[PDB]
Amino acid sequence: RFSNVEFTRPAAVSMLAASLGGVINVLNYPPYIRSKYHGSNSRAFKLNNGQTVFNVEALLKPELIKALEGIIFSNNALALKQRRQQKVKNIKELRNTLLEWFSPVFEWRLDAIENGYDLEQLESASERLEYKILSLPDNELPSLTIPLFRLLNEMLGGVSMTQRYAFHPKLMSPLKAALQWLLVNLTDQKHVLIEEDDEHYRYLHLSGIRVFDAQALSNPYCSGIPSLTAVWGMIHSYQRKLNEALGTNVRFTSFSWFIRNYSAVAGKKLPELSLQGAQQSRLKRPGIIDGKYCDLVFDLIIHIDGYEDDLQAVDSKPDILKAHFPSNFAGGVMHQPELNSNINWCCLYSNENQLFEKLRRLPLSGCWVMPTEHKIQDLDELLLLLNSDSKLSPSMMGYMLLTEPMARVGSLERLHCYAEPAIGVVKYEAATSVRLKGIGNYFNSAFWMLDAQEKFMLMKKV
Amino acid sequence: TPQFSPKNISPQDLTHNNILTLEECYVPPNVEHIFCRFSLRVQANSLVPS
Amino acid sequence: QIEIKTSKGSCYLIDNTRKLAWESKWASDDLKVLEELSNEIESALTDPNVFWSADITAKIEASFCQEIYPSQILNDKVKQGEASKQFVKAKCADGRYAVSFNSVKIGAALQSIDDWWDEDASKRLRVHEFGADKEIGVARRPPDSEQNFY
RNA sequence: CUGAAAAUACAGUGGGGCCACUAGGGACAGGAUUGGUGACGUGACCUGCCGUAUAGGCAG
DNA sequence: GGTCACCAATCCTGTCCCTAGTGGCCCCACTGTGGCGGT
DNA sequence: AACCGCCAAAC
Numbered sequence: 001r002f003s004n005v006e007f008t009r010p011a012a013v014s015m016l017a018a019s020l021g022g023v024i025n026v027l028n029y030p031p032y033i034r035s036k037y038h039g040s041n042s043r044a045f046k047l048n049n050g051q052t053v054f055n056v057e058a059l060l061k062p063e064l065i066k067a068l069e070g071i072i073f074s075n076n077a078l079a080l081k082q083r084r085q086q087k088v089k090n091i092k093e094l095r096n097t098l099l100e101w102f103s104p105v106f107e108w109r110l111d112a113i114e115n116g117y118d119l120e121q122l123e124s125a126s127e128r129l130e131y132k133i134l135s136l137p138d139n140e141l142p143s144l145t146i147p148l149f150r151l152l153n154e155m156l157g158g159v160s161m162t163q164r165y166a167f168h169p170k171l172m173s174p175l176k177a178a179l180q181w182l183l184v185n186l187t188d189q190k191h192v193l194i195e196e197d198d199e200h201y202r203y204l205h206l207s208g209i210r211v212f213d214a215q216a217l218s219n220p221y222c223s224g225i226p227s228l229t230a231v232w233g234m235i236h237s238y239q240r241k242l243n244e245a246l247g248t249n250v251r252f253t254s255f256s257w258f259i260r261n262y263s264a265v266a267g268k269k270l271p272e273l274s275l276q277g278a279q280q281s282r283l284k285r286p287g288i289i290d291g292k293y294c295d296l297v298f299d300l301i302i303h304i305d306g307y308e309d310d311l312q313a314v315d316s317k318p319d320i321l322k323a324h325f326p327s328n329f330a331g332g333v334m335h336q337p338e339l340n341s342n343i344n345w346c347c348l349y350s351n352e353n354q355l356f357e358k359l360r361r362l363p364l365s366g367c368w369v370m371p372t373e374h375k376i377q378d379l380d381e382l383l384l385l386l387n388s389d390s391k392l393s394p395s396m397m398g399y400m401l402l403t404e405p406m407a408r409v410g411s412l413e414r415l416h417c418y419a420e421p422a423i424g425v426v427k428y429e430a431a432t433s434v435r436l437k438g439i440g441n442y443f444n445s446a447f448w449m450l451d452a453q454e455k456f457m458l459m460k461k462v
Numbered sequence: 463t464p465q466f467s468p469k470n471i472s473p474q475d476l477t478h479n480n481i482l483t484l485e486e487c488y489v490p491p492n493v494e495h496i497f498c499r500f501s502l503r504v505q506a507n508s509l510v511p512s
Numbered sequence: 513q514i515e516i517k518t519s520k521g522s523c524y525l526i527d528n529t530r531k532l533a534w535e536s537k538w539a540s541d542d543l544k545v546l547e548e549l550s551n552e553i554e555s556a557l558t559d560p561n562v563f564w565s566a567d568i569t570a571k572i573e574a575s576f577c578q579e580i581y582p583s584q585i586l587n588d589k590v591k592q593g594e595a596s597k598q599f600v601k602a603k604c605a606d607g608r609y610a611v612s613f614n615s616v617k618i619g620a621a622l623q624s625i626d627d628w629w630d631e632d633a634s635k636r637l638r639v640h641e642f643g644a645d646k647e648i649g650v651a652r653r654p655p656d657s658e659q660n661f662y
Numbered sequence: 663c664u665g666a667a668a669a670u671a672c673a674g675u676g677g678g679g680c681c682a683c684u685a686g687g688g689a690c691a692g693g694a695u696u697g698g699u700g701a702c703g704u705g706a707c708c709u710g711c712c713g714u715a716u717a718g719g720c721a722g
Numbered sequence: 723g724g725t726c727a728c729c730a731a732t733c734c735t736g737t738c739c740c741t742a743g744t745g746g747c748c749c750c751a752c753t754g755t756g757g758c759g760g761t
Numbered sequence: 762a763a764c765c766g767c768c769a770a771a772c
Binding site for chain 1: 519561614615
């Protein structure tokens with residue numbers, strides 16, 4: 001998927017631009033959030049790790065048993081656990097796939113208390129919102145599990161049609177699905193974390209943030225969401241202003257980013273009149289540069305570290321916290337939600353359970369921007385990996401330094417360096433997937449940090 | 463249950479009723495006889511297939 | 513009728529904008545609204561440790577099937593199939609586009625305050641480093657003069 | 663301390679003229695819905711007077 | 723004082739047409755938005 | 762020498 005950027009006189013830009021008549025192609029993978037209709041086990045069968053039939057049914061196994069017996073480097077039992085570490089994540093993925101549609105059904109049945117997409121058609125669909133899956137409560141349904149065990153009989157007809165039923169493990173997969181039930185629900189999990197410290201940490205939840213005309217071109221290769229370095233830079237500017245205002249020394253270490261609304265804005269931007277340079281600098285209009293712009297509504301969760309003296313100095317001043325929230329984002333104008341919305345848009349949290357209890361009330365159509373750990377050696381692997389999964393997107397990760405930092409005339413700072421924008425991959429996970437995957441998964445595998453090293457500065461996990 | 467085992471719902475809910483909305487036909491009081499009449503026509507349709 | 517709601521919790525109302533101008537003498541209540549909101553904006557401009565937002569709504573008594581004049585997009589590479597004149601849109605909660613003004617268009621209107629460029633200047637220019645006049649297409653504070661910003 | 667700061671796309675506008683969907687037409691044969699069922703007694707609406715009056719008015 | 727009885731049933735046999743055709747005329751905008759070496 | 766000239770074409 002590619003979108004176009006046109007240039008007026010391409011020969012002035014480069015020879016590559018001149019060869020293509022100024023029409024440069026950029027990777028177009030924006031988030032797709034729809035308000036409308038819900039229209040089966042469908043979401044699993046579609047996720048196709050998953051089910052219906054194949055890629056990769058059937059194990060039928062022999063495959064799984066052989067893998068465990070090979071991993072029996074270090075003692076049959078210790079091997080099965082080492083197999084499980086990858087094979088349990090693989091066995092967890094099978095349950096997560098199966099749950100993708102159970103997630104959708106539940107979801108509907110909340111919004112509704114009425115409906116699915118189609119109430120009767122759902123009731124007809126072998127794995128949809130049944131008044132039996134209706135409950136008991138989430139919590140008691142997971143505590144019951146029972147539903148998960150029953151669905152194993154239904155998985156004699158779909159979630160692998162016929163073959164590979166008693167075969168290496170089906171019992172172990174059923175047990176994992178029965179365990180996932182307990183994880184799938186509610187009023188459970190809760191506590192004990194080396195992150196951040198603890199002496200304590202804080203969680204700053206910014207909700208319903210509206211942005212108008214932010215640069216959709218993250219780097220000049222990729223189009224879609226704004227750059228994560230833009231989100232980092234905004235959060236760092238917010239930290240600096242707060243630490244200089246209050247006289248504290250708190251650190252805004254990591255953030256998680258949830259997009260509610262996204263829309264592409266048509267048209268180019270007209271530059272104002274200025275002294276345009278020549279042999280004689282004249283007051284005129286500069287050249288019209290084509291770009292990509294988006295209107296988006298999002299939530300940020302920022303993870304604050306420091307001393308409790310500084311944290312309770314921050315918590316004591318809510319107006320001064322609100323005051324230094326920036327109004328710039330990726331070139332666009334950034335506003336708090338409307339004054340008649342009745343939304344407290346700048347909230348602090350001391351514990352994780354209270355924050356997750358607030359966070360699972362988000363709109364279900366919205367997308368979590370999630371970090372991945374996929375490896376890419378060239379463009380063709382990335383394109384195959386993009387043609388594989390429909391919810392992955394190529395985005396800006398950060399800067400690979402070309403030259404050595406040194407004193408250069410016209411530099412903003414003491415040392416200047418020329419760098420190259422690095423292309424990575426993000427995941428647009430649904431709100432429901434993050435809700436069912438549990439509090440631990442969310443607080444470990446949703447938060448971005450800037451790995452600032454000698455020769456590169458890249459956005460990554462942890 | 464389907465294989466004869468009592469499932470545990472309230473002891474008070476077993477003596478509980480169902481509301482039935484029926485139509486009822488009774489003879490009016492002090493009407494001695496009722497009448498049922500139908501007409502029967504017979505045709506010779508079993509000699510030849512239609 | 514212009515309604516202004518503030519993050520502070522104020523609620524200002526101008527009843528009819530046809531009765532106001534830049535140079536005309538206003539009523540007392542409209543001057544009170546000006547005074548109060550000017551104080552709030554000045555407080556927001558001068559103190560870094562206060563948050564200040566405002567929701568500003570104009571309610572216009574429409575004529576029967578009256579024409580609306582929103583922002584027009586910049587397009588110098590229009591195709592044969594497309595419209596030569598298009599409008600700036602904002603997508604709603606559903607898949608419907610409200611016709612809208614650009615932020616810079618509103619910004620340009622609010623900062624049309626500069627009438628210091630002459631001793632008896634009637635026109636108010638949009639604040640520019642060289643006092644650029646869009647209608648005439650000249651600089652009112654030219655680069656060769658001492659009236660420009662630099 | 664954000665592929666960093668800053669940014670008014672605008673003015674004008676006549677789709678018009680003409681117009682025949684038509685002709686023809688078998689939905690048809692057969693049919694057992696059936697068995698079984700308690701609306702109230704933890705409640706206010708009482709006790710009297712006037713009046714020819716199951717009319718109509720009144721006292722606690 | 724409160725609920726809206728269970729036990730099974732959804733029919734088989736045959737077909738959706740033929741003819742002919744979707745117009746002429748004229749037109750699709752003016753303003754602005756360039757860096758760089760040289761005579 | 763300050764000001765007319767040279768230069769591109771993808772689906």
